Amino acid sequence: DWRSALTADEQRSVRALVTATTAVDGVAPVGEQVLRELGQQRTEHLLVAGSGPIIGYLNLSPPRGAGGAMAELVVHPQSRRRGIGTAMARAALAKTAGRNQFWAHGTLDPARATASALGLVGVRELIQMRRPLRDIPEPTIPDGVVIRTYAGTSDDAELLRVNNAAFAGHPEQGGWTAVQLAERRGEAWFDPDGLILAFGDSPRERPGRLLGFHWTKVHPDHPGLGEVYVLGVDPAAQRRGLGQMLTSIGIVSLARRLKTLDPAVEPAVLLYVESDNVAAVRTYQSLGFTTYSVDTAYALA
Numbered sequence: 001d002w003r004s005a006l007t008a009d010e011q012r013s014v015r016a017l018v019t020a021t022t023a024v025d026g027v028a029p030v031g032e033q034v035l036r037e038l039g040q041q042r043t044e045h046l047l048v049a050g051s052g053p054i055i056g057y058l059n060l061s062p063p064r065g066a067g068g069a070m071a072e073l074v075v076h077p078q079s080r081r082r083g084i085g086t087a088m089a090r091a092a093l094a095k096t097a098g099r100n101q102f103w104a105h106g107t108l109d110p111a112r113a114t115a116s117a118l119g120l121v122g123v124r125e126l127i128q129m130r131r132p133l134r135d136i137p138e139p140t141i142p143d144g145v146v147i148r149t150y151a152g153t154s155d156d157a158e159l160l161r162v163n164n165a166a167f168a169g170h171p172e173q174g175g176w177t178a179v180q181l182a183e184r185r186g187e188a189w190f191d192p193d194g195l196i197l198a199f200g201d202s203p204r205e206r207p208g209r210l211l212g213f214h215w216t217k218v219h220p221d222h223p224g225l226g227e228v229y230v231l232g233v234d235p236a237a238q239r240r241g242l243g244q245m246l247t248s249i250g251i252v253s254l255a256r257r258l259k260t261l262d263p264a265v266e267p268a269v270l271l272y273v274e275s276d277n278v279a280a281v282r283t284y285q286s287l288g289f290t291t292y293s294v295d296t297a298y299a300l301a
């Protein structure tokens with residue numbers, strides 16, 4: 001039975017399934033956007049009850065922007081190999097007439113095996129890379145560039161202009177409106193001091209225009225973990241060293257934010273990047289990031 005919205009109680013039950021599974025598998029089974037979708041009316045949901053907590057959950061997001069339908073799903077660790085995962089995946093495939101993809105975060109063995117049993121193949125590879133926060137860079141800020149941080153909604157127009165130009169065609173990051181910014185500003189981890197903006201200054205043709213930005217994020221449920229959450233440079237100002245510079249500034253910012261009674265943890269910064277985004281992979285390789293895990297999107301061949 002598909003539901004177009006979930007009650008507060010249903011949301012609490014799905015969240016418990018997701019967090020419990022994250023602890024057992026070592027990787028969250030559904031992404032952050034699915035957790036935001038639990039309380040909105042934009043997607044469709046399947047809930048599978050035991051004989052009785054919720055033991056299976058699938059979210060199906062419809063096409064939006066340049067992207068197609070996408071499903072994420074999870075089955076309680078103690079209810080696996082009972083056919084629930086197959087049942088939910090077949091339902092989504094039948095509902096979209098075989099057109100949706102499925103994310104397997106961390107591309108764990110059970111998901112690889114389920115994908116083969118269903119006849120699916122990997123069609124998209126999202127790599128998670130990490131770099132320790134030791135030996136931080138000294139960033140070089142070129143003349144004609146001034147850096148500052150997010151001041152509030154007066155900065156949204158420029159941020160959206162640069163985001164949509166840099167991510168034109170990106171299935172999830174492109175074609176944003178003020179609503180996408182607002183839903184992330186309401187997240188517990190949002191910190192205006194961690195959204196770094198690079199503006200053109202007098203020397204350049206367009207003083208005051210945003211050239212690029214680096215939105216950093218500190219993970220709340222993982223001590224010592226930061227993220228290059230969104231990094232983007234206006235196409236008009238690309239290939240001039242600004243991406244490398246912005247990434248370095250954000251690493252410095254995170255290093256500063258991440259005593260005797262603090263647990264010993266070697267802090268690290270992670271990022272996600274499409275395997276075929278050549279420009280970005282080169283920028284990150286240059287700065288010492290290395291592969292950590294892979295998220296694979298599966299679909300009909």
Ligand SMILES: CC(=O)SCCNC(=O)CCNC(=O)[C@H](O)C(C)(C)COP(=O)(O)OP(=O)(O)OC[C@H]1O[C@@H](n2cnc3c(N)ncnc32)[C@H](O)[C@@H]1OP(=O)(O)O
Pocket residue numbers: 025029072073074075076079080081082083084085086087089102103104105108109110111113114115117118120298
């Ligand atoms: C294509 C995808 O599954 S993308 C979904 C990604 N989600 C995740 O990876 C989240 C964490 N994992 C889970 O929630 C679950 O392990 C799932 C959803 C991947 C599979 O859920 P389950 O309900 O256990 O799947 P299901 O019982 O239908 O298994 C179907 C077949 O896949 C294979 N399979 C599933 N898990 C495994 C495993 N751990 N080892 C080997 N084969 C497996 C088997 O052939 C199985 O049939 P069988 O039990 O008769 O041998």
Ligand SMILES: N[C@@H](CS)C(=O)N[C@H]1[C@@H](O[C@@H]2[C@H](O)[C@H](O)[C@@H](O)[C@H](O)[C@H]2O)O[C@H](CO)[C@@H](O)[C@@H]1O
Pocket residue numbers: 030031032033103126172173217227228229230231271272273274295
């Ligand atoms: N870096 C951008 C542009 S390359 C990107 O690729 N980000 C990716 C990444 O976002 C992740 C967030 O960054 C991370 O904070 C959160 O914890 C995860 O659950 C995902 O929401 O994974 C998503 C798929 O799961 C994808 O839709 C998105 O574009």
